[PDB]
Amino acid sequence: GAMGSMERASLIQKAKLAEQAERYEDMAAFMKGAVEKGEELSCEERNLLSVAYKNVVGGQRAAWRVLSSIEQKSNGPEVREYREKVETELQGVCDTVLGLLDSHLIKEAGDAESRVFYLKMKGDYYRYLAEVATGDDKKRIIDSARSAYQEAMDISKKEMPPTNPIRLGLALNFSVFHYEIANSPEEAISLAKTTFDEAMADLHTLSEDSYKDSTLIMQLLRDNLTLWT
């Protein structure tokens, strides 16, 4: 690939620099490069991968929502055309991420944390595809997201404590999936509440730093619950 000639450590270093410069497209390219070196990623490296693509796709989703809103309120072909271009670009980014997961992140992920993180990611990028899909494709995409999230949940509940930030993050996102995507607000609320409640009871085992990581995500669960109830 385009980053194939750069040292693995240099790609990671440059991803960190790109993050500091808020150059998220660059950061994603560097992290794609790093994945494509063929070695398993560390916890820090998974964070960098996730931050990079989440920010790129975040920007695309924000742009798409703006354009769709203008398209809706406008009901020439320029708005629909431009919305479709952004849509295609977003689809391309999701396909790239799913590709990375397929080649070969998930298949080599043997530990709970790595496997859950990647399965969570699979769920997230199908969820983004679902936001812009229609018809039968949408139904299949939605079910694919649900399958990935559910497998992640199953592993997380068996192998990780309820304060694990990856477990918490997964539940947060899967809860949003239920509410916004699958139109299952009771499942969304139940998942968020139970996740919060189980984590609360395990907080006493955490160092100050881990306590901060876990309670941050718990706040986001509360924030969403506040919106939904």
Partner: peptide, 5 residues
């Protein structure tokens, strides 16, 4: 627009 991570 709800929180995700």
């Amino acid at each position: 627009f709800p929180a995700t991570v």
